[PDB]
């Protein structure tokens, strides 16, 4: 049973706590689908939120402390000394659009029957591995590298090691979620995360509106900027 698998997985994550479902979301029949499909969805959501949260945490350290590439790019418009909330606000509107669009294309590839079936896998709600990003073996142009393990460093890893890696993924993702939203919360409700008091600056604006402020409308292309 999917709930029995999630039971065991929770024990692996933390045997002291074990399963902690005060809301019974695994039991709730979301979309009318069965418990297996609902648990698949919930595990995929957990792993994805965690993944993006850890990426966001490292991005917070990179941007707010100052870590930029060199050359012509969206980097050249963000003011120097700008905090992590303002770097996203300062990159161009097209940069925001194309970042979100590339992320959307990656997720479309993730949930597409095409790539998942080419890899001999199924959707996470229909008897598949929750949180598995397929190789780009069904993309039309043969794609050089895959998203997960692009250099294939884990081609020969034990199934036990991979299971333990997924267990580490879930916990680290949850913790990174907590830390990243700690960074967010300290800027809008001061004195909410005691340790971050004085470190994270305050920000006025809506975080959860992606395109506000719309940002500069500069044209950074140089060699062949006919579209301006």
């Amino acid at each position: 049973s999917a709930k029995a698998d999630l039971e065991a997985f929770a024990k692996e994550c933390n045997p002291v706590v074990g399963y902690w479902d005060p809301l019974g979301l695994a039991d709730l029949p979301l979309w009318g689908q069965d418990q297996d499909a609902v648990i698949g969805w919930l595990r995929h959501s957990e792993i994805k939120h965690g993944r993006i949260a850890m990426a966001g945490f490292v991005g917070y350290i990179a941007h707010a402390n100052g870590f930029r590439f060199g050359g012509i790019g969206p980097q050249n418009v963000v003011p120097e000394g700008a905090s992590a909330p303002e770097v996203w606000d300062s990159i161009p509107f097209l940069a925001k659009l194309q970042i979100i669009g590339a992320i959307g294309v990656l997720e479309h590839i993730s949930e597409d029957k095409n790539f998942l079936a080419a890899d001999g896998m199924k959707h996470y709600m229909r008897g598949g591995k929750p949180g598995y990003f397929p190789t780009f073996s069904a993309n039309v142009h043969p794609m050089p590298l895959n998203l997960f393990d692009p250099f294939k460093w884990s081609k020969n890893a034990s199934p036990e090691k991979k299971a333990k890696g997924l267990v580490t993924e879930t916990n680290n993702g949850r913790l990174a979620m907590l830390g990243l939203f700690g960074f967010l919360s300290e800027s809008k409700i001061p004195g909410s995360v005691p340790a971050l008091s004085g470190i994270i600056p305050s920000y006025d604006g809506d975080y959860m509106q992606p395109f506000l402020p719309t940002g500069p409308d500069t044209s950074l292309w140089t060699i062949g900027n006919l579209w301006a």
């Binding site: 709730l28 029949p29 009318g32 418990q35």
Partner: protein, 179 residues
């Protein structure tokens, strides 16, 4: 009446009916009593939650209520009675009329009627459109129905405390004199 649900440890496993209104109640009368209790409980739960949200300071509805006539959700104010006085008569009539249509649908559409041998409080449309309480077993569903009854009885006392604080000022403690 002893086999009608709603009893709990708060009464001591026994029915709370000191005046003996259950003695003079038949099966139909008892079904009517339970149906009225369920309806009043649900109404009071919604009323208390709405009044607490509006008066407490929660983020109320953005935008206008009436573009023409210039009535705004913010402009209506946080006092519940003043808000229901300042909302347009068209809006009041509309709320009441939709509630009336739903009441008449609950009465007629549920063909096995709660008075004529049916389940009291079985308004068919207005329950669980997303199917949350679909896979619950009968035991937990009975537990949750008892939860509905208890919570709503408390809610009825709460809303009457609210209107008592508004009408008879300084009546209930933990309700500022205005409302």
């Amino acid at each position: 009446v002893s086999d009608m649900e709603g009893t709990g440890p708060e009464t001591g496993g026994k029915v709370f009916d000191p005046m003996g209104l259950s003695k003079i109640a038949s099966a139909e009368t008892l079904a009517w009593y339970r149906a009225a209790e369920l309806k009043h409980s649900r109404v009071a739960m919604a009323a208390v939650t709405g009044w607490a949200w509006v008066s407490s300071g929660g983020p109320l509805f953005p935008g206008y209520l009436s573009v023409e006539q210039g009535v705004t959700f913010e402009s209506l104010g946080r006092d519940g009675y003043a808000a229901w006085a300042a909302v347009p008569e068209a809006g009041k009539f509309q709320i009441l009329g939709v509630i009336g249509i739903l009441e008449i649908l609950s009465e007629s559409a549920v063909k096995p009627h709660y008075m004529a041998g049916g389940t009291p409080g079985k308004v068919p449309l207005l329950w669980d459109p997303l199917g949350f309480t679909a896979k619950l077993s009968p035991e937990t569903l009975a537990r949750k129905r008892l939860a509905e009854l208890k919570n709503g009885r408390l809610a009825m006392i709460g809303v009457m405390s609210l209107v008592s604080a508004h009408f008879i000022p300084n009546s209930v403690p933990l309700l500022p004199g205005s409302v």
